[PDB]
From a paper:
Synaptic pLGICs play a central role in fast neuronal signalling, translating neurotransmitter release into an electrical signal by opening an ion channel gate depolarising the transmembrane potential. Five protein subunits are arranged in homo- or heteropentameric pseudo-symmetry around a central ion-conducting pore. Ligand binding at the subunit interfaces at the extracellular domain (ECD) is relayed to the 6-nm-distant transmembrane domain (TMD) comprised of four α-helices per subunit (M1–M4). We report the structures of 5HT3R reconstituted into lipid bilayers in the presence and absence of its native agonist serotonin (5-HT).
The final apo-5HT3R-Salipro particle set yielded a main C5 symmetric map (apo-C5, from 61% of the particles), as well as an asymmetric map (apo-C1, from 39% of the particles) at nominal resolutions of 3.2 and 3.1 Å, respectively. Thus, unless stated otherwise, the main symmetric apo conformation (referred to as apo-5HT3R-Salipro) is used in subsequent analyses. In the apo state, the lipid-facing M1, M3, and M4 helices of 5HT3R-Salipro are significantly tilted compared to their positions in detergent. The largest displacement is observed for M4 which is tilted by ~9°, displacing W426 on the intracellular side by 10.6 Å. Helices M1 and M3 are likewise tilted by ~15° and ~9°, respectively, yielding displacements of ~7 Å (measured at the intracellular residues C243 and L307, respectively). Consequently, the receptor in Salipro is markedly shorter along the central channel axis than in detergent (40 vs 48 Å at the TMD). These rearrangements place W426 and W320 at the energetically favourable headgroup region of the lipid bilayer. The compression of the TMD along the pore axis compared to the 5HT3R-detergent structures is likely a direct consequence of the thickness of the hydrophobic core of the lipid membrane which is less malleable than a detergent micelle surrounding the receptor. No water molecules were observed in the central ion pore region during simulations of the apo-5HT3R-Salipro model, while a continuous water channel was observed for the serotonin-5HT3R-Salipro model. In the apo-5HT3R-detergent form the distance between post-M4 and the TM bundle is markedly larger than for the receptor in Salipro, precluding the stabilisation of (1) pre-M1 through a cation–π interaction between R217 and W459 observed in the presence of cholesterol, and (2) the Cys loop through the interactions between F144 and the hydrophobic pocket.
Residue numbers in the entry:
A (entry chain E), B (entry chain D), C (entry chain A), D (entry chain C), E (entry chain B): 8 to 312, 317 to 333, 402 to 462
């Protein structure tokens, strides 16, 4: 006598058709459960609005023809079969824009009551809407819809194998060391008809993820905050100090390089914009502004007199704030060291006033930036 | 009795030939409808003049041999068949320079009157002429011609399944969050003969898209406009102020870095050129120009006298604008502080005049830039 | 008479089934030994937390049906068979997120007692937790779990072919010239059940590797240490020396560029952070700090008097440290060269004190950096 | 009666052998015409010396066995056959280092007299010698040899389908918007024998292309020419003007960044070198040279006297060009303002002479650069 | 009568087995000659220690079953057969870490005495030890071992087809325009046993290559040498000249950018280091050193007196080298212009001495660099 593992495999696979749906009455569908686990988050391309994941996609369904009596064959109740030798459902992710590179599992299991169990390490790449407004603290609701491309609901009703609560909690297999965390995955059924009789079963999986903003924080914000503080203290100087002006130039160069670094190297998609680079743009803007202002005042150090305009403007401004003759050749030579103050000094002083006012409001800008930052931190920690 | 889903699949696919065109009289073609939907715009490579899209290409055609009487088989009127087990038309996009990575749909449908329904998530990559003249506000008319590579019109007449108006309006499935929008897709039939009897049916699809210039605007133009304004105000200074000249040097460094950033990081193909970097090149040019001019004047501060040439030139210029002796040792020591003005001052003043004239016209250049910008905005919003 | 190499190949492969597990009694598993060698470490992507290796994966198992009597066939005891013509186990690496590009070995060996010997140059790509805390001196414990995706332990018990000590020592085939070294590979068996009756055999291989930090050392740290030393010596200067302040600006630019270079070009994942760039951030921070301080003092050179606050603060500070009249016009003109010291000098001196205190503690920071460096060196050499 | 399209396909493909060369007398070859069209120039990698093209490769040959009498079968004279069901020639491009990604055309045509017509959108990647001497204006003669890898001339004689003049003129299908133009494609037959009896037919296709140097011109040369002009005018200054020297430093920084940008971002292979970056290297060199010279002179401003050496050298140089006592304390204090000229002035003047001589010859260098540029333009326009 | 090309192909391929080794007595191996030609050197990745080549791998071996009598079949002595229809040896390159993309040759030849001739354009990618010590002038001995992965020497003895001298000289087919040259390829047989009875034939091919250092020379060294010379001449200045110090800062910025460019853009693996960047690191180091020294001296310009320490140190140093009263108010006001020299001058002079000593030894460093360079040139030209 032969092995029953041969005799049964000879029985079940002979006179079988991989194309014909495995059912005796066509009017019934062949229902298909699934189960999804997130092994890891391989990569997140914020620019192209796509996602890279690796999952352990299980699958279960029934085949009327893959049935036997265990007692007739060695009391056997399971059997390995090649997946390519039987009918298989053409499940497909709606967001699957590009083919996933993953190895084909050459076998499946079968039970003595038509059941089938196909597991595989499905790797996938999908599209997703990615918000960059909270760029370090970004949290997403990327989706994974599961369905047949063609087979209607009347042939294939997608279902779930595990219970949904069990699915959301399941973090049995995950690599936390990645840049991106994972919070849960909510499954939900849906029916989908673009037009009549095109009913298609569906099973959405609201994948949720959270970024670890530590690295971005230390790498980006703290250098920016140091730049902010050096601008803050640089404004303390008196305007026509020349290398006060060159110091604002130094800060301009640093801010320029950093602002450049943002979309040089850091992810910044075209849709929307993050507020962080916005605030940095603003601070650089105010820097160059008062760079021009102290330069204006430096021109005004040279005797130059528009003081009427200036004067009523500062009034409204602060309203809104609410032989011996020859040895006196040498005397005059001395006092000419600062005799030009009689014109230079009014404009010098009011320029100093501008410097300090502008300094206060720039400080307020940096304050708003920090407030926003702490708000985003709290929101990130909120879930 | 067996299942009719088996008995009919056994009937239809036995004694079938995938190669032979599915028709009884060869003189007739096998007409093929299609339908096209734009799931998304994955990427746009402005440099290589190509496009990346993901579409839901449907397809319909008739097969004389895939016919049956429903009553003979379980009153059945539909059936799933493997796509690889029957004749298929070799439709192919003319612009399809590189193979699209997309998964093969292993099944199709068939009706009891020879009809076939093949749907698939065809991903594709094509060439396209891309205008960069309106770089942020670029709007394109990229095409997708559909045809058989070989089969003549006498075997295969391409058609359309839906009506064209329905097709242009259809944005049922699209992801607006991408960098690129989508306006519509115009279908149109065409016949194509390079030479006689090589008639080939065709079906063009004038894909239309629109960029969201917000990110590029904030990231590029506003920094550039701030650079423009600091140059504007820097020109207010008097020429031989030394760090006026160093300030123009600072602006030169910033403009250099930015102009470099343009084709460093921002898309800029070799065909044509965008006007934005053009205007920036111009403003940098005028900056370095008057950097040289104030330097020229600084040399002229040193006593140096070509004032005849200068003098008739400024005339035509403004025409076109239309013991006690020893204590006077110390007196002369004092007045020698500015006795050199007798030569320095004429050249100093006319240099100041150059600075201000050049400042006005540079302002006009920046004005033209802004006018152009608003024009492009209006054109972008026009459709 | 024909060749026996033909007659036996005709005997063994006819009436064979690639799908059926090669066994006579299903209740027994088909045990599978393995053996692993590390040809090379192709690449290590610290960012994406993955690994690239090339290995010589051997494999051994038994087939009850691939049995013969050597005497009946030319006294033959070995035979080459195509691997695609027989049953094969579906071994698969758990961390195998992306398919390895490797060539298929078209043949195997078989012995006259059911034994099989399949060797292949399996290339693979896996995930791994990668610590960057000791960025140059990083040492990892990346893993390679081996198992069947589906087949339970009751069908397939993974084992080892060689002995484990022999395996760990084996560096017969390895390329030491790569960036990454290799220390050993520890094999270990494991059983794995997510839930009941889902027992799956496993065989982990704790791959160990060590970086050669020479290049990173010379390329990164020594330039940084030179930057550190120039800041050290720059602090020796007196505060209101103007280009002392510009020298700190120079160092700020250099430090900025280098700190930028770190995550520009050098690997720096998002999880955790290396201490090296941390220390560099700190030194840059102290530089910009005292840049602001000497600037503050430069403002204070201008007559300005907050000296009460300063004075009790420095007290607590050092507690914690524990006609002739007209020719005297010219006399006063002379002595006015430094008559402003009466106010400038106290603030100047205490600013000098700040410079030197801050210099000492910055020196201590650089000291801690060097201590850490030597510690990591010793740890690296420790194994 | 069945369809003749079935009956003939049943006749022709039964008892056919895809491997056997389709011929009755082996002594004759099976001649093969071709035809080549350039759809587009996808990319040109100047570094790796390769080329990316997309072509419409037609092909024609005879099959003695694929013959029928039209009258016997529906008066039919054409027929679609799957390409994979018949003999095909193994044509292969000699420069085809890397496999072209292109879709397989699943059908061909056949006529009733053994003729076959296979068209396909062959995409390819080849090697090519690429001259960068005229980097913007580069024009190439990249080749595409066509042949069988194995089949000798005695089995396969390559030929041409169209006439060669028709082929060179044909630009029916081409996309001019690419960076690269196309001028023509010259076909030519060749016989090729490395050694005796290894005669192999061949069909070379001298693809010709021309770059559109507009973008490179505006993006590279004009900024460089502006740099040139600012150096030109900067040399007008007198040497020991300090920020003359700092201005040459500014230009040095700009030139450095640009020279870096060249092989940073612009294509520059290792074989040979373009003259454009050469000229830029030269101008930067002369800048740093006279930067050192004005620095030398600045040291010489300090009293320092080598004037004998200098003096005979300038001779040969220009040969080759072919109480009251106390109020005179204050008098001497005044005249000491420039009493150091008695030594500073000779060296100052001769340094000025060096500045101007060096300025003239640097101007000549820039002149040569421009002359070369116009020459290359004319050559580019020449064909 | 049929064609003999059909009748013989029908004879030879019927009753054939692709798996069984083509031999009548198993005790003999099936010996396999080869031949190798280097079409081109596609790419060399110095970082990953790999190589990219394109070769024309021929192959020859015998098949006992593919034998016929020419006279019985049209006096035929050659025949084209599909390669996939017969036994083939599983030759494989030991260094073949990643699969080569190359097209499959669908045919082979066969002669009437069992001989087979398979040619193919094998493309490959391998690992190789790459020395970067002579980075521009690097010359390698990269290897290509050929063998069967499995089949022992007792089944397959690798051999060579051509003679070895003929093989080393053969440069019939090569593209010299690439970055990399080729000198020769030495073939050599080897036997290989990790352990007993695992004898495996082998055929190593010591590929040799040489870089064309022209581009790297002009692009890297000459700018570096110009930097060296400007530092050389900058050291001529007197120390407390302020923009001497700023000039060393300029050179520091340039050197920094260049040193950064090295491993930014130029290949620099982690194993070992090139001496060129080493020398550049050294010169930058000495620059920043004496930048600090002139800064030290500038502090010492301020009256400051450690001159005892300095004095005995310079001794050992050079040992190792082996009313009227009021008008004298104005007199003293004058002479106070340099009365501070009484302390400033000793320290100033000895600082000048340091500058010049350090200048000499830095010159020596640059000298050593140039000597090394010429040495490497000579070595490169040596073969």
């Amino acid at each position: 006598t032969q092995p029953a593992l041969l005799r049964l495999s000879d029985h079940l696979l002979a006179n079988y058709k991989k194309g014909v749906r495995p059912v005796r009455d066509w009017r019934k569908p062949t229902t298909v459960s699934i189960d999804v686990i997130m092994y890891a988050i391989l990569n997140v391309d914020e620019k192209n609005q796509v996602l890279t994941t690796y999952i352990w996609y299980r699958q279960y369904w029934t085949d009327e023809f893959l049935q036997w009596t265990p007692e007739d064959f060695d009391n056997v109740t399971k059997l390995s079969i090649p997946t390519d030798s039987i009918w298989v459902p053409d499940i497909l992710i709606n967001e699957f824009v590009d083919v996933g590179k993953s190895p084909n599992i050459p076998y499946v299991y079968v039970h003595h009551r038509g059941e089938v169990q196909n597991y595989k390490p499905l790797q996938l790449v999908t599209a997703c809407s990615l918000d960059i407004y909270n760029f370090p603290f970004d949290v997403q609701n990327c989706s994974l819809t599961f369905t047949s491309w063609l087979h209607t609901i009347q042939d294939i009703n997608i279902t779930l194998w595990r219970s949904p609560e069990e699915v959301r909690s399941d973090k049995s297999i995950f690599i936390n060391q990645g840049e991106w965390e994972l919070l849960e995955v909510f499954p939900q059924f849906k029916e989908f008809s673009i037009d009549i009789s095109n009913s298609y079963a569906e099973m959405k999986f609201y994948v949720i993820i959270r970024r670890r903003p530590l690295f971005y924080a230390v790498s980006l914000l703290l250098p920016s905050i140091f730049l902010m503080v050096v601008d803050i203290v640089g404004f303390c100087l008196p305007p026509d100090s020349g290398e006060r002006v060159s110091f604002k130039i130094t800060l301009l160069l640093g801010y320029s390089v950093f602002l450049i670094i943002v979309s040089d190297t850091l992810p910044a998609t075209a849709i929307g914009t993050p507020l962080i680079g916005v605030y940095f743009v603003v601070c650089m803007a105010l820097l160059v502004i008062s760079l021009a202002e102290t330069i204006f005042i430096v021109r005004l150090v040279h005797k130059q007199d528009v003081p009427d305009w200036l004067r009523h403007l500062v009034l409204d401004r602060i309203a809104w704030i609410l032989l011996l003759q020859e040895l006196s050749s040498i005397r005059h030579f001395l006092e000419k060291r600062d005799e030009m103050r009689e014109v230079a000094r009014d404009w010098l002083r009011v320029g100093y006033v501008l410097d300090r006012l502008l300094f206060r409001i720039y400080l307020l800008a940096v304050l708003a930036y920090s407030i926003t930052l702490v708000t985003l931190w709290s929101i990130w920690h909120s879930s």
